[PDB]
Design an enzyme around this catalytic site. Sequence first.
Site, PDB file in Angstrom:
ATOM      1  N   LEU A 220       0.682   3.026  -4.033  1.00  0.00           N
ATOM      2  CA  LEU A 220      -0.447   3.496  -3.753  1.00  0.00           C
ATOM      3  C   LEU A 220      -0.049   4.516  -3.011  1.00  0.00           C
ATOM      4  CD1 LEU A 220      -3.805   1.248  -3.130  1.00  0.00           C
ATOM      5  CD2 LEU A 220      -2.805   2.684  -5.536  1.00  0.00           C
ATOM      6  N   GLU A 221       0.574   4.512  -1.641  1.00  0.00           N
ATOM      7  CA  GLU A 221       1.092   6.211  -1.222  1.00  0.00           C
ATOM      8  C   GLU A 221       1.771   6.967  -1.950  1.00  0.00           C
ATOM      9  OE1 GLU A 221      -1.192   6.623   1.598  1.00  0.00           O
ATOM     10  OE2 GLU A 221      -2.109   4.875   0.599  1.00  0.00           O
ATOM     11  N   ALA A 222       2.859   6.297  -2.741  1.00  0.00           N
ATOM     12  CA  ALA A 222       3.758   6.722  -3.624  1.00  0.00           C
ATOM     13  C   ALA A 222       2.848   7.692  -4.631  1.00  0.00           C
ATOM     14  CB  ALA A 222       4.931   5.701  -3.767  1.00  0.00           C
TER      15      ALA A 222
ATOM     16  N   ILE B 109       0.670  -0.915  -0.061  1.00  0.00           N
ATOM     17  CA  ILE B 109       0.000   0.285   0.338  1.00  0.00           C
ATOM     18  C   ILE B 109       1.432   1.536  -0.367  1.00  0.00           C
ATOM     19  CG2 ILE B 109      -1.694   1.037   1.534  1.00  0.00           C
ATOM     20  CD1 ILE B 109      -2.970  -1.464   2.401  1.00  0.00           C
TER      21      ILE B 109
ATOM     22  N   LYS C 233      -0.153   8.889  -4.453  1.00  0.00           N
ATOM     23  CA  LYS C 233      -0.913  10.672  -3.568  1.00  0.00           C
ATOM     24  C   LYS C 233       0.415  11.103  -3.215  1.00  0.00           C
ATOM     25  CE  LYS C 233      -4.261   7.816  -1.375  1.00  0.00           C
ATOM     26  NZ  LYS C 233      -4.512   6.555  -0.110  1.00  0.00           N
TER      27      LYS C 233
END
Lengths: 247, 261
Positions: free
Chosen positions: A159-161, A155, A163
Site C-alpha cells: 500500500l505505501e509503495a 502495508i 502511495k
Amino acid sequence: NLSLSQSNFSADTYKSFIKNLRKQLTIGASYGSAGIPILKHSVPICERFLLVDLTNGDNETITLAINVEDAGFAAYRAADRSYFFQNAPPIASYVIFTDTNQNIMNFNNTFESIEIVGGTTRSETPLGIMHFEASIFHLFVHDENYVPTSFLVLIQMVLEAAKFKFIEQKVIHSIMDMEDFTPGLAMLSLEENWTQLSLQLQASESLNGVFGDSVSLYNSMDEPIGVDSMYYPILTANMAFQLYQCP
Amino acid sequence: NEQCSPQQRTTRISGRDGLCVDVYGALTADGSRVILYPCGQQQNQQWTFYPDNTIRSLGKCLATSALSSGSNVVITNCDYLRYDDGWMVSSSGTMMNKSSHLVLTANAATSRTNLTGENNVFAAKQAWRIGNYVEPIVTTIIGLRHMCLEATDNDTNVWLESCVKNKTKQYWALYSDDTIRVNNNRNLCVSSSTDSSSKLIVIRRCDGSINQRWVFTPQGTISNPGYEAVMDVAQNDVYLKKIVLSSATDKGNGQQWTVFY
Ligand SMILES: *[C@@H]1O[C@H](CO)[C@@H](O)[C@H](O)[C@H]1NC(C)=O
Ligand SMILES: *[C@@H]1O[C@H](CO)[C@@H](O)[C@H](O)[C@H]1NC(C)=O
C-alpha cells in the site's frame, strides 16, 4: 483479483502489480492543478473494497480488502476464515468475505496501533522477499505473534509503495538484489505525511500552489527537506495519489 | 474545514541558478525593482502569498511594470491593483501576469540580473520554485530497466546504467529553475539537442535555455514544456546508450522515470 505470487516475483512483476493497483484505486479519482489523482470519497459500502490476492511460497493465498477511500487494509481472508480490523467500517463484514468464519482483530489498521500490539516498530521490521513471503504465511495461518509485523510488512510493501514511487523503488532495489532493508527516515516521513500532503496539495489551489503549512520529507542522507508548495519534485514525481480532503 | 482555505503563507521564490527573488536594497518606494540575488533570510526575499493572487514583500505587491515585454518587475502599493486579477502560477513553476500573459524572467546572460516580464517560451530562466527550501535537490533519476541516468564521456553525454549507490556520476542536482545538473559539476545541465538533425539529449554548459528546462510530471514523464516533448530511451533499448527527446506516447515504458533521493 489483482494478484502477486511468490513464484513469479521479479522487479518487473512487482512493478506491474503496483502500477495496476494504482490504476484500480484511482478509477473515478478527481484531479486538481497538480494532476495527482485524489481517491474517491463517500463511496457506497458495497463498492468500497478492492480485493487483491497475495500468494506465498507454499501456494497459499490470502485476499486482502483495501478501502478505496484511504488505500488502507480493512480485512483479509485466508481459506474459509477472515479477519477484520477493529476500525474497519462497521458494515464491512456484511459486504466482504461473507461466506467465511469472520473474526475481529483487537487492534486498529493504523501503524500506531499495530506497533503497540506487536511491541515492534517499522524501523526495526525488515522488508524484502523473505519478509513479504513470510508475512503472507503468518497471515494465512493467523499466527497471532506474527500478525502485527506481517501487516507492517505488507502495508508498506503493497500500500505505501502504491502511495509513493519512492517506496516502490526501495522495494524494487530490495528485490533486484535480494537485499533486505528497514525503512529509514525518507520512507517513514512519506508514510507519516500522506494525509498532510493530501490536505496541503488540495488546500493550495487557493494560494497559487503554496501550502498552508510546511511538510518535512527526509532524503536518503537523513536531511529534512521542507515542502511548503507543490513545486518540489520529491512530492510531485513521487506521491501517486492523495486522500480526499477538500471541496 | 479551515485548513482547506489557508489565508496566507510566507515563503521564498528561487529560480535561475538557485538565486532568490529579491527586492533590491529592500527599498519600498512604488516601482522598486526586483532582482535575482543569492538566497538568505532577509525580509526583502520573503514573499507572502494571499488568496487574492497577490505576492507581497515589505508590504507591497509584486507586479509587472509594462504591458509589453522587457520592463522590470517591481513592487508597488497593493491598492494600485484593486481592479487586477493578479498572478497565476502554473503547475510547472511559470509565474504569469493573468492579464498581460507576461512571465517572470531572469533574461540577461548573467544570473545577476534585473527580473523582467517577458513573453513565455518556457526557458529555464522563466522557471521558478516557490518555496522556503531553495537548495538543489540531490537525487538519482531512475528509468527503463530500473536503471539510473549517468553523466558520461567527461560529463558531455547521459544514458542509463545499472544503479550503483554512491557512484558519483549517477547523482543529479535538481535546481529551482527546473534544470537537472551534474551533481559534482553544477555548471553543467542536461540539455535537449541544439542541432536540429539530432534528438539526442546531452550535457552542456547551463545557459537558461528552453533546452534545459525539465518538469517531472505527475504522469511519470520528464517533460520539456517548451518543446512539447519528453525524455525517452532510444528504441526502448538501454544498451543503445541514447536518451532522446520525443513526443509523448504510451507504446513502451521508455518515457517513464522517477526520482530516488
Ligand atoms: C482506533 O480507531 C477508532 C475509530 O474507529 C478510535 O475510536 C480509537 O480511539 C482508535 N484506537 C486507538 C487507541 O488508536
Ligand atoms: C498585470 O499586467 C497588467 C497589464 O500590463 C497590469 O495592469 C497589472 O498591474 C499587472 N499585475 C501584476 C500583479 O503584475
